[PDB]
């Protein structure tokens, strides 16, 4: 079937720039041009240019003031989208699509998933998670008992969190990530069903951050 | 106008019919071009809904449907399904700016979602978090319908006035909303009162949780 692939996610600081590609598969790739079209958070979808997958050609939005570069390459199937000197305005989910031909127009009939863009100077970190509790860890008194993981001082967004009792994944409560002043984030995750007693080590909560090529799990929640 | 024009924001009831309208200007509806729609629902990318004022690429059902007038456009969508909700763009092309243009988008509301009152966990700092020399209190506010929420906290039975960082509530992948509020205290601060309260506020009621650092010991 036609399909896109982008790339994945970047972080950029001001005034550097950034390359995301997109690779096509199931159809003849010299015979669909591609377009790049981005979304900001708050605005809306945004037209960003045109490449001739066969001659190379490209039409680009005057918004840009020429800091965009398309280019394909045809061996590989592949277009790329070049933004050099970005700024807070760049930070955005960027596009990829297919420009199909109809009897009386075109339209963009076939969208890649999307490469997040993040245009920050604070540096990339590894989240910090502490196991939270409600309930003392060993209750008495027959209140239930909940599990939670916090996980505090990363960026950029988002982290993935996931949730076992042994090795079987357990359903979770997931809520908004918040940014505080220092610009990092801050985020929790909840065990869904309440415990009564469990051996130490039983269930755990995993964080990953793709950003940081990194994954952190809390498996042991102390007494207080 | 160089651009495209959609409301913010319709709703409807399941079962029922919304249309979204879409106008343009001299440039782009009125320099002859067709519009198109786009289908974004959460988390995905845009899908291609309607091409060429109202055809329908293959697999598109029927009840999704496009019109377009010289001044004005319209994407239907009859039998609303809960699957339907998410945002809706309309699309041209704009000889002024010589350029591909979008609408600001319209986001679809499904109604008969029941209202849901919100699950409200508070939880102590961890010991971990205290011997790094932190405090934070935590407030998880889970399924509830719909999204407004309003958060108090109280140190003993005084209201707290500062420290305080609450998310916007959003919903999650169950349809329903969640939302945290996070207290930021010193491992002083912590200990020194008898007890703190996170007070949650949802449709005419509200529900405290408490939490000393005394119990668990
Ligand atoms: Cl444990």
């Known amino acids: 079937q036609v399909q896109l692939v982008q790339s994945g996610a970047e972080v950029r600081n001001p005034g550097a720039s950034v390359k995301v590609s997109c690779k096509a598969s199931?159809?003849?790739?010299?015979?669909?041009?591609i377009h790049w079209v981005r979304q900001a958070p708050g605005h809306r979808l945004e037209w960003v240019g045109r490449?001739?997958?066969?001659?190379?050609?490209?039409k680009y939005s005057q918004k840009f003031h020429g800091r965009v570069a398309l280019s394909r390459d045809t061996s590989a199937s592949t277009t790329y989208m070049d933004l050099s000197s970005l700024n807070s305005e760049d930070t955005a989910v960027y596009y990829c699509?297919?420009?199909?031909?109809?009897?009386?127009?075109?339209?963009?009939?076939?969208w890649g998933q999307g490469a997040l863009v993040t245009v920050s100077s604070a540096p990339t970190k590894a989240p910090d998670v502490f196991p939270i509790i409600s309930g003392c860890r060993h209750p008495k008194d027959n209140s239930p008992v909940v599990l939670a993981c916090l996980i505090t001082g990363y960026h950029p967004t988002s982290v993935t969190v996931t949730w076992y009792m042994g090795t079987q994944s357990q359903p979770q409560r997931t809520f908004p990530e918040i940014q505080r002043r220092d610009s990092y984030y801050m985020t929790s995750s909840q065990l869904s069903t309440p415990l009564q007693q469990w051996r130490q080590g039983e269930y755990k909560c995993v964080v990953q951050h793709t950003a940081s090529k990194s994954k952190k799990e809390i498996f042991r929640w102390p007494e207080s | 106008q160089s651009a495209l024009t959609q409301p913010p924001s319709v709703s409807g009831a399941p079962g029922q019919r919304v249309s979204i309208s879409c106008t343009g200007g001299?440039?782009?509806?009125?320099?002859?071009?067709?519009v198109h729609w786009y289908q974004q629902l959460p988390a995905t990318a845009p899908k291609l809904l309607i091409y060429?004022?109202?055809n329908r690429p293959s697999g598109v059902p029927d009840r999704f449907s496009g019109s377009k007038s010289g001044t004005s456009a319209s994407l239907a969508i009859t039998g609303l399904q809960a699957e339907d909700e998410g945002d809706y763009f309309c699309?041209?092309?704009?000889?002024?700016?010589?350029?591909?243009?979008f609408g600001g988008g319209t986001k679809l509301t499904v109604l008969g979602q029941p209202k849901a009152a919100p699950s409200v966990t508070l939880f102590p700092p961890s010991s971990e978090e205290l011997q790094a020399n932190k405090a934070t209190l935590v407030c998880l506010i889970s399924d509830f319908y719909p999204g407004a929420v309003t958060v108090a906290w109280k140190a003993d039975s005084s209201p707290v006035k500062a420290g305080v960082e609450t998310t916007t509530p959003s919903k999650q992948s169950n349809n329903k909303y969640a939302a945290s509020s996070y207290l930021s205290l010193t491992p002083e601060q912590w200990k020194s009162h008898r007890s703190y309260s996170c007070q949650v506020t949802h449709e005419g009621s509200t529900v405290e949780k408490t939490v000393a650092p005394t119990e668990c010991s």
């Open positions: 699509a297919r420009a199909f031909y109809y009897s009386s127009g075109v339209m963009f009939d076939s």
């Open positions: 199931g159809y003849t790739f010299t015979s669909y041009a």
């Open positions: 490449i001739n997958t066969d001659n190379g050609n490209t």
């Open positions: 001299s440039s782009n509806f009125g320099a002859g071009y067709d």
């Open positions: 060429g004022n109202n």
């Open positions: 699309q041209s092309f704009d000889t002024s700016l010589s350029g591909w243009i």
